[PDB]
Symmetry: D2
Subunit: 171 residues, 4 copies
């Protein structure tokens, strides 16, 4: 036999251990349209109908975005857009209200509630109206049979909607 | 009432969804010592005893490294080093053998098997010996009651040892 | 050499694979008290203050219940009760309202909103009042620095409150 | 307004929280065949070829078993059987050896090592041979592109093989 001394410079005393990390995917959509009717005299929404081009998703990552279009997510070939249609606005006060509407994702429809929070009602520089409001609320993937193949473990059953809107009077 | 048109430039149609991601933590130790007895005539290890300074862990991230020293991981104040002591080497052939030894982590001891893979036996430039070998094997956190507070979900019960050694003859 | 034939009766061609499963822990509390002021003329809550004896938790499992009392959950020795104090009731209509109050868990306090849903307002057999309502809402463990040691992976950051109340007039 | 007292008997102060639980799926196969050549003089395997009817899986649960046959697992319509073919047996001693072979799952093939552990070599009541051995080892789903759709989070990349064999001499 024979004795050796490590060469610390070309020796690695190494280990690998697997762990999980929870993180939020944040995303918007670049391309959508809305029809907004609002009465600044009473701080009530009268009609709110949004259509979102699924195609235009942006989670700040190209490969995931493309993946979102596929059969196991949006199926944008078949169902190119998601729609929201307001059915009812219940004023709480001038800053706050409960908004009820029909959300349609990949052809499945469910009535959801969003929390309307009016961040500002104004008359502009030019004497024409402005508003700034937010719509917030949790929807469940399962309620829309959305991404059924993906486990509620890997990806949460809960999506959190945060629609932040600035908007000016028409014509 | 009154009609508005979104200002696309100050409107975000946004969502947040939580997901899990699996990843490997890879780490070595900067500071360790070893005693290596090997017989290049028969490709057998005769004695292999390593001591690793827990303090010197490096997972390429400072905040985790410091955290590894704490009570819920290594407890480096109380147990500053981990030790491996070979008990038995069973040659398979000149490239391969089963190494049995006692691993001690934070004062708990268990007999583990590593797979010896001899990457090269040589005589150096100067006519003095060299060897290059690896030791590989899976150990279970649970077997060493290590990081008991951390769930086997978050952090895997399995640690994978990959000890890569270059070493030269002594004196 | 020699040839053999399996004894199918004492042969197991076996495998073990680890998987995760998501499930809800459901629980109530056996022991709590409440003070309830309500105006059946206007369907408004006037005062609603609840105190819950942490000790009396019941998740239909004894070992978990005991565990819930410990330092890494409720710390029932130090903080024996959780309290809810209503601060504001905003009527939506006679069936629905937004309730705002202060929740206190292990000495940490946060203002939460619950969704009041009045399931029934009545005059009893005896001509004395009754009500049946529910309070629902999501609270975040993190907002109350509750069970900080447990990862948001293993146990969800979201707790869902479902307070189902039947109640009769006093004196 | 008016004051009420809870009816503790029809009041639930309730909560629901989601958590993950890790567990092992254990399974065998009811229907398989093997060809076993072994030399009790030298405790060496000479030939070991197994074929397993995927159809006959049993994880003590019918709905999962059926599911295992489907496209996202075994695809038993296309690939009805899994095969193991020994390529090399390296004796360690009479109780232990390293077995190398080709595992084929759903038409994908990889060379794996199992740890042979000979639990007993005998001559029977009738003077004809017996053996009892085990084969153990970890295989990676990813190495066989098996259940590619299922995340390594939900279901572990590691399957642990435990083949427990009793067997008697032929003819
Ligand atoms: C013979 C050398 C043995 C090396 C064994 C070292 C065991 C290291 C365990 C590391 C754990 C990392 C945890 C990261 C925290 C993320 C949550
Ligand atoms: C009214 C606007 C509604 C917006 C709802 C959009 C739902 C988005 C779901 C995104 C899913 C991301 C999955 C990432 C894949 C990682 C695995
Ligand atoms: C030589 C014998 C080899 C046996 C290998 C069999 C591999 C079995 C994999 C089983 C997967 C179970 C998945 C359960 C679904 C839960 C989600
Ligand atoms: C107004 C009433 C509020 C009820 C809130 C109670 C919060 C309960 C949290 C329970 C946590 C269960 C954890 C199970 C341990 C499994 C790991």
């Amino acid at each position: 036999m024979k004795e050796y001394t490590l060469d610390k410079a070309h020796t690695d005393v190494g280990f690998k251990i697997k762990h999980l990390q929870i993180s939020n995917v944040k995303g918007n959509f670049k391309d959508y349209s809305a029809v907004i009717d609002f009465d600044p005299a009473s701080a009530e929404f009268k009609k709110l109908d949004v259509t979102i081009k699924i195609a235009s998703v942006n989670t700040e990552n190209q490969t995931r975005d493309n993946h979102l279009q596929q059969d196991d997510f949006f199926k944008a070939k078949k169902y190119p857009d998601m729609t929201f249609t307001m059915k009812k606005y219940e004023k709480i006060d001038n800053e706050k209200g409960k908004m009820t509407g029909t959300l349609t994702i990949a052809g499945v429809s469910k009535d959801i509630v969003l929390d309307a929070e009016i961040g500002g009602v104004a008359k502009g520089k030019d004497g024409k109206e402005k508003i700034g409001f937010s719509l917030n609320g949790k929807i469940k993937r399962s309620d829309f049979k959305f991404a059924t193949s993906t486990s509620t473990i890997t990806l949460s059953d809960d999506i959190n909607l945060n629609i932040e809107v600035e908007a000016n009077e028409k014509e």
